Write an enzyme that holds these catalytic residues in place. Structure first.
Site, short mmCIF file in Angstrom:
data_model
loop_
_atom_site.label_atom_id
_atom_site.label_comp_id
_atom_site.label_asym_id
_atom_site.label_seq_id
_atom_site.Cartn_x
_atom_site.Cartn_y
_atom_site.Cartn_z
N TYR B 144 0.80 -1.10 -0.13
CA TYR B 144 0.21 0.23 0.08
C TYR B 144 1.04 1.08 0.27
CZ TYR B 144 -3.79 3.68 1.84
OH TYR B 144 -4.43 4.26 2.00
N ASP B 214 8.92 2.25 0.59
CA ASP B 214 8.30 3.64 1.36
C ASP B 214 8.14 2.97 2.71
OD1 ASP B 214 5.50 3.99 2.61
OD2 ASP B 214 4.39 3.64 0.83
N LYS B 242 3.89 8.51 9.44
CA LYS B 242 3.44 8.04 10.54
C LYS B 242 4.30 8.59 12.06
CE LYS B 242 1.67 3.77 9.68
NZ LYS B 242 0.87 5.17 8.32
C1 LIG Z 1 3.15 1.65 3.94
C2 LIG Z 1 2.35 2.75 3.78
N1 LIG Z 1 2.84 3.76 2.75
C3 LIG Z 1 1.77 4.58 2.52
C4 LIG Z 1 0.89 4.49 4.14
C5 LIG Z 1 -0.39 6.38 3.96
O1 LIG Z 1 0.21 7.36 4.74
P1 LIG Z 1 -1.15 7.70 5.21
O2 LIG Z 1 -2.41 7.31 5.79
O3 LIG Z 1 -0.18 9.06 5.98
O4 LIG Z 1 -1.85 9.43 4.26
C6 LIG Z 1 0.97 4.25 4.67
C7 LIG Z 1 0.07 4.03 5.95
C8 LIG Z 1 2.25 3.62 5.17
O5 LIG Z 1 1.72 2.26 5.99
#
Ligand SMILES: Cc1ncc(COP(=O)(O)O)c(C)c1O
Ligand SMILES: Cc1ncc(COP(=O)(O)O)c(C)c1O
Ligand SMILES: NC[C@@H](N)CCC(=O)O
EC number: 5.4.3.8
Lengths: 427, 402
Positions: B144, B214, B242
């Site tokens: 994701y 990521d 985060k």
């Molecule tokens: C691996 C990863 N990429 C992107 C996100 C998206 O970040 P946010 O929810 O702050 O937009 C999250 C939550 C994530 O765990």
């Protein structure tokens, strides 16, 4: 006028971040370079790391309508954080803020909170297509709706100020779905529909433009867009991230009487923290997950801190006399500035609606992005530096609207005019 | 076990917001459909609007590594807001957090702060394409990266080098690069096989393509420098989120100097944000990173998480339930399947029906776990030896009744 401390910070910042800033708009490139580093803000003022004090008309770009560090917003934040800043689960405060937004904005019956205006515009773009089953979108030249790929076409804000072309890194196959046209041009909009039967999802725009100077819609323009979108089963979307809660409690849609199908929100709803939102007709919002098939999530979305700040900001804005005071002091500022250019012999034109105003160095009038590009950007640069030295802080761009707050006083306005007189007389 | 107040609140919510939540997973659809509404959190616990107390293993999905409402973070935030929460201009604190990040993350030489992990992924995708002048991108099934979407995205199975090689061979000089979670958390906990990360590093270099990590979820949790520091592989660009926000909305993307120079105002690629780099978010990030640099931080997290992970897998043995899992530092996994799990396909073999019951059971015993089988678990510096024992005791009672 010393700016020794700011130059040091900025010099070191360029080695750590692209152009030494977190947002291109803070550049100062088109106004002589060398930005000032802020130390703190309060009410209608801002302070340099060098000690200089300014009457601020940028208002952190919109959020500070109640003035910087309003005491009732800060007290409410202190009490709230004792309970933790984020849960990652539902909380009572999300329900409260949601009701307040629904009652305030005419077109919103169901809402969804995100963390920024960019996030709100991206989601509404994806919902426009999902609901109508069409791929093409219509946007106006000079308008700005965040940096999602499809929107990087003839954008305003920083791109205009920096004179950048349609950004690279975005596939031509995705921008092919973005149709543009001049602002205030109903005829250009009809042609687009004529040449693209059954392909247009809808139209998105700034009900009152703020990202290419201050521009108001011509008589019949908004009504016209509402009329032709109904004809072809297309959606009318209002980006009120900047105008919402400023032009009026219910935004431009409330003041000018036209109701869109979906609208975006930001800045003021966060009262100073990161917040955004998108809502509209219930039958449209039903497609958003988990209620529907269109997935859209966010970890910090709806955290208690931000909700608390939004709730408190809207309560202050509900007090009687709020929007009248804003119109009164802003009109006196706008008219004054125009009277002064007149007496010192400078071509200029502008206007204001509530606490939003604009001032161009051209006789115009200004009806679109093309007329705006005719302003004397060389003169504006000197004007901006002169004001900065007289203690007035204006947006570092001829293409950004300025703002006033509930904390600005009659005396602050008079002081701004006296300063404008001094600067322009020496131009 | 009363949940009267929660049911009432969540019911009114569905008439105001889509599905009654601000983010999908919060609706509990994968485990019954009845979420509990929170009132406050502190240390390692969370409290109901009905007065119920739980030991939290979600930690607001990552940020709460130091524990909920850490007294030193809250205190610093109280002092900083007297000066205002947003400026809309540069502030000295942006310089501070920026240096700290450059010194901690191997591949980061220049950074740009944003407001979420999602804004960061949008920006990094666009920067990848602009730098190489190519449009194709490769991602993995089960990973994701926000909703940044379109036949310009090729997908492949996690832990499968061969499938990746093939994708390059069929699209010569069209791939801008590869983006993935160095350690998966968004579809169960999944570690990379031997040589998988190294494989990707080498394969991308051969075609003058970019490798992107990521680490919005792994950064500062797996190790101070993330997965790239613990496992030794260095990417070209990386995204963060985060934890560096310490509880407030914050994000970031950085990498090699020459690539970041394309970002406006220094370059032609446009990306902006009104609230980006505000003093409140920066203050939270600075103090969170300072607490992590204290002695024995990551050793402690591995110690208590191994007891929990092992205990759980052992409890499942006594009670006769097929199961497999694992943990690295303060991040763990657990699936109801013999496994092992190497990819998204293996993970779907889990017995969801059983997970749903196991979840409610633990919820009733006073343990709050992610409302989904396809989500990783988390521990913090506030979880104690006792908290772990009580959790294992509760799991014994629940699994002995499934
Ligand atoms: C691996 C990863 N990429 C992107 C996100 C998206 O970040 P946010 O929810 O702050 O937009 C999250 C939550 C994530 O765990
Ligand atoms: C009209 C308008 N829409 C969207 C945005 C982007 O919002 P943000 O900067 O919070 O991402 C801005 C700045 C704006 O002025
Ligand atoms: N130029 C438009 C402003 N509302 C802010 C832009 C930004 O800093 O992201």
């Amino acid at each position: 006028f010393k700016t020794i401390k700011s130059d040091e910070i900025f010099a070191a910042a360029q080695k750590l971040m692209p152009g030494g800033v977190s947002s291109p708009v803070r550049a100062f490139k088109s106004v002589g370079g060398q930005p000032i580093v802020f130390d703190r803000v309060k009410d209608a003022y801002a302070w340099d790391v060098d000690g200089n004090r300014y009457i601020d008309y940028v208002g952190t770009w919109g959020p500070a309508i109640c003035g910087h560090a309003h005491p009732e917003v800060i007290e409410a934040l202190k009490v709230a954080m004792e309970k933790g800043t984020s849960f990652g689960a539902p909380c009572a405060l999300e329900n409260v803020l949601a009701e307040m937004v629904n009652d305030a904005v005419p077109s919103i019956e169901m809402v969804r909170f995100v963390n920024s205006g960019t996030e709100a515009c991206m989601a509404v773009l994806r919902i426009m297509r999902a609901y109508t089953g069409r791929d093409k979108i219509i946007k106006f030249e000079g308008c700005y709706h965040g940096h999602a790929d499809m929107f990087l076409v003839k954008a305003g804000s920083g791109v205009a100020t920096l004179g950048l072309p349609s950004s690279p890194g975005v596939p031509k196959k995705t921008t092919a779905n973005t149709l543009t046209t001049p602002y205030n041009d109903l005829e250009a909009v009809k042609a687009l529909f004529a040449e693209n039967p059954g392909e247009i999802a809808g139209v998105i725009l700034e009900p009152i433009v703020g990202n290419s100077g201050f521009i108001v819609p011509d008589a019949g323009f908004l009504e016209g867009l509402r009329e032709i979108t109904l004809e072809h089963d297309a959606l009318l979307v209002f980006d009120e991230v900047m105008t919402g809660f400023r032009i009026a409690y219910g935004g431009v849609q409330e003041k000018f009487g036209v109701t869109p199908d979906l609208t975006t929100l930001g800045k003021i709803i966060g009262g100073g923290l990161p917040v955004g939102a998108y809502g509209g007709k219930r039958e449209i919002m039903q497609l958003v997950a988990p209620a529907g098939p269109m997935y859209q999530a966010g970890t910090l979305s709806g955290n208690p801190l931000a909700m608390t700040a939004g709730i408190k900001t809207l309560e202050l804005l509900r007090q009687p006399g709020t929007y009248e005071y804003l119109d009164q002091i802003t009109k006196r500022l706008s008219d004054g500035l125009l009277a002064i250019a007149q007496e010192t012999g400078h071509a200029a034109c502008g206007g204001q609606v509530s606490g939003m105003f604009g001032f161009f160095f051209t006789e115009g009038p200004v009806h679109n992005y093309e007329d705006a590009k005719k302003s004397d950007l060389q003169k504006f640069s000197r004007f901006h530096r002169g004001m900065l030295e007289q203690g007035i802080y204006l947006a570092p761009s001829q293409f950004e609207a300025g703002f006033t707050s509930l904390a600005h006083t009659e005396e602050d306005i008079d002081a701004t005019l006296a300063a404008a007189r001094t600067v322009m007389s020496a131009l």
